[PDB]
């Protein structure tokens, strides 16, 4: 019954910059008792910081703690690439723990649009009943991206799904997959499959498209 | 040298129950509680309660009573979480965490996940994907692999055995018919394709089956 709201979401930075995580606690004077953990992806979280103000033994003092009550902050004085993660900030001061969703730290690139790619159906697919066509939206920043599916100019959400990976290592852009699947009958009573992206980068629609009567 | 050693990965259907275990090492396992927190696929972490280390008693928070348990080996350094009548949203990472009290915690298992469902063990069909018109874009030409309806995960998707690192986007699986599917994607030069063969490698250590599917021309 106690909520710990973290600002911003997301926040995207390049190395040396000092950033600013912000906490802020609904109830009491929570007094110091506030904690902040580093998580990186497929890993346990690790401690950094205890009662608001210490560092623990192992963390570097670029990370610093700071605030009481109802306000903290979790301080980088210049952001290091190994500092890439999501970051919590819990309170210990009342029962039960609670836990504030987390800032996501992103590496800052220039934007850069998706290069798109369809792909209908392979004929394997097609031989046992099945019609999945396939659309690659790759190496774009940053991250936001909406994207439609559109059957011969009419859109279509049902049969969709997406999966998308996280910052690349080298780039440091995204990508995403978004496949519309169907059965091979359904498939063949229509003729054109389209999908196209909105995106920061571009003002109008990224498309991509085929038409199974086109050869 | 403080550590949290926490058992392997497990299945289980829904109705069963599963118990994990969290094994202390370095300190003095009675001088310190022991909590454990849930972490969803997508999600932020959610503390479900602790465990008295000397008295061997579990405070519960309200959403994880009634179908869970704590418990310990005192002479072991270990502490247990047993979860009972597993439904699917207990699909999830458990963490153990060392308690310090109004501090909350410090040192963290390294996870175990939990996966509940009632598919069993199934090979994936594995889909080469060739380009058509508008799929190349400059010298670049993209080429694709579709894998559909396996469990478990994982599968290991590479490209020519792994010699096709450069340019490729595999991606999470997502579930599908309480099944899985990941696609990847592969760019290179169009003068390398299809000159040069290229070929998506799908290994599935749970049915033991390996598969390359080259992708060829439409």
């Known amino acids: 019954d106690i909520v710990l709201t973290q600002s911003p979401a997301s926040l995207a930075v390049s190395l040396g910059q000092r950033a600013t995580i912000s906490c802020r606690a609904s109830q009491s004077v929570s007094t110091s008792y506030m904690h902040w953990y580093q998580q990186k992806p497929g890993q346990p979280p690790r401690l950094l910081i205890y009662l608001v103000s210490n560092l623990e033994s192992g963390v570097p003092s670029r990370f610093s703690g700071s605030g009481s009550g109802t306000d903290f902050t979790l301080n980088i004085h210049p952001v290091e690439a190994e500092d890439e993660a999501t970051y919590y900030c819990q309170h210990i001061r009342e029962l039960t723990r609670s836990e504030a969703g987390p800032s996501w730290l992103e590496i800052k690139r220039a934007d850069a649009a998706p290069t798109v790619s369809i792909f209908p159906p392979s004929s394997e697919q097609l031989t046992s009943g099945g019609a999945s066509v396939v659309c690659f939206l790759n190496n774009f920043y940053p991250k936001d991206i909406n994207v439609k599916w559109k059957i011969d100019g009419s859109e279509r959400q049902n049969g969709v799904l997406n999966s998308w990976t996280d910052q690349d290592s080298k780039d440091s852009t995204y990508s995403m997959s978004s496949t519309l699947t169907l059965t091979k009958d359904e498939y063949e009573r229509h003729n054109s499959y389209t999908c196209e992206a909105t995106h920061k980068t571009s003002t109008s629609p990224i498309v991509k498209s085929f038409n199974r009567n086109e050869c | 040298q403080v550590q949290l050693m926490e058992s392997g990965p497990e299945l289980k259907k829904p109705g069963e129950t599963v118990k994990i275990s969290c094994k202390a090492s370095?300190?003095?396992?009675?001088?310190?509680?022991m909590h454990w927190v849930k972490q969803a696929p997508g999600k932020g972490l959610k503390w479900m309660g602790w465990?008295?280390?000397?008295?061997?008693?579990?405070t519960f928070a309200a959403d994880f009573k009634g179908r869970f348990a704590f418990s310990l080996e005192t002479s072991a350094s270990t502490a247990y979480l047993q979860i009972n009548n597993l439904k699917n949203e207990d699909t999830a990472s458990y963490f153990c965490?060392?308690?310090?009290?109004?501090?909350?915690?410090?040192?963290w298992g390294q996870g175990t996940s939990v996966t509940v469902s009632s598919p069993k063990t199934t090979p994936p069909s594995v889909y080469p994907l060739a380009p058509v018109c508008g799929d190349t874009t400059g010298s670049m030409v993209t080429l694709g692999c579709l894998v559909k309806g396996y469990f478990p995960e994982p599968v290991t998707v590479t490209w020519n055995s792994g010699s096709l690192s450069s340019g490729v986007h595999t991606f999470p699986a997502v579930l599908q018919s309480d099944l899985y599917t990941l696609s990847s994607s592969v760019t290179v030069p169009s003068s390398t394709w299809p000159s040069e063969t290229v070929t998506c490698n799908v290994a599935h250590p749970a049915s033991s089956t390996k598969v390359d599917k080259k992708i060829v021309p439409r």
């Open positions: 465990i008295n280390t000397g008295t061997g008693e579990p």
């Open positions: 370095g300190y003095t396992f009675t001088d310190y509680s």
């Open positions: 965490a060392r308690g310090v009290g109004l501090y909350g915690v410090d040192y």
